[model samples]
Target: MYGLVNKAIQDMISKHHGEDTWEAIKQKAGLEDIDFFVGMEAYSDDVTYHLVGAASEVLGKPAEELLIAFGEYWVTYTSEEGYGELLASAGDSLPEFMENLDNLHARVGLSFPQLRPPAFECQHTSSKSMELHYQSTRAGLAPMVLGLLHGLGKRFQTKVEVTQTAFRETGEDHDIFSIKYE
Candidate 1:
């Protein structure tokens, strides 16, 4: 993961919980020395996991819920962080943006090497429905994907209904989503 990811997690916490709590989270995560994160720098995945782990305890919230919050924040964060144009070019609607997610990440990858992006394969069953096959090098982020979808739905002003049809943890090829949109 990149420090930008951590930074977003940092921003999300501070934005919602205030700076004092952000400091508390950083301290709890054993990252008291990090004054700030460089948006373009890479950090080990452990840093992110530890932040989530420590934050859940500090805030008395579940890690999955926190990740989902971060996922939603990411949509707003990236747009405000100068990715608005790229995001705008991705699509004008929810399903189109969902379809172009991989391309969106590819555009983002130009500035950052060592980017391990997730793969999304959309199988549209109808104008308002699709099956999303998601593959990632990492694990335990399925909830975040759901949050991202909701955020996109908000962005497009679309009604979205999504359910996990398959789980990667169960040894499936990849996680699968049954999505219906308006």
Candidate 2:
């Protein structure tokens, strides 16, 4: 993972919880000595995991809850950080945006060479529903996918319902998400 991600975590916490809360979380994560992270530099995934764990413990929240909230906050955070134009150009609607997800990630990858974005393939099952095929090299982020979908729904102002139709834990090759939207 890149420091951009850790920085995002820091930003999300500071924005929502406050700087003092962020300081506590950082200390709890055993990162008290770390002052800043260069957004383009890569950091140990363990650092990120530790931060999340510490945040969960200090805040008395579940890791899933934090990840989900982070997922939601990411939309507004990125948009506010001058990616709004790019995000706007991605698509005007949820389905449209989803269909172009790979393209969006590809464009982002050009700027952040260290990014290892997941692959998404969407299959329309009905006029108001689709199956999103998600494949990633990482594990335990299924909840984050759900959060992203929810965030996108909010972004598009579309009501969405998502169900994990398939799971990688059961030996499946990839995770499947059945999504229905209005």
lDDT of 1 by residue, 15-54 (tens): 7889999888899999998889988899989899999999
Task: Show model 1 residue runs off by greater than 4 Å.
Answer: none
Q: Write the per-residue lDDT of candidate 2 for residues 1-182, one digit (tens) a residue.
A: 87877888899888888988999999999998889877778888888888999999989999989998877777877788768999998999999999999999999898888788998999988999999999997887787899889999999999999999999999999999999998
Deviation of model 2 at 163, angstroms: 1.2
Highest lDDT scorer: 1
Global lDDT of each candidate:
0.90, 0.89
Lowest lDDT block of 10, candidate 1: 67-76
Q: How close is candidate 2 to the true structure, as a TM-score?
A: 0.93
Top model by TM-score, which number? 1
Locate the minimum summed-lDDT window of 10 residues in model 2.
Answer: 73-82
Name the lDDT of candidate 2: 0.89
Off by over 4 Å in 2: none
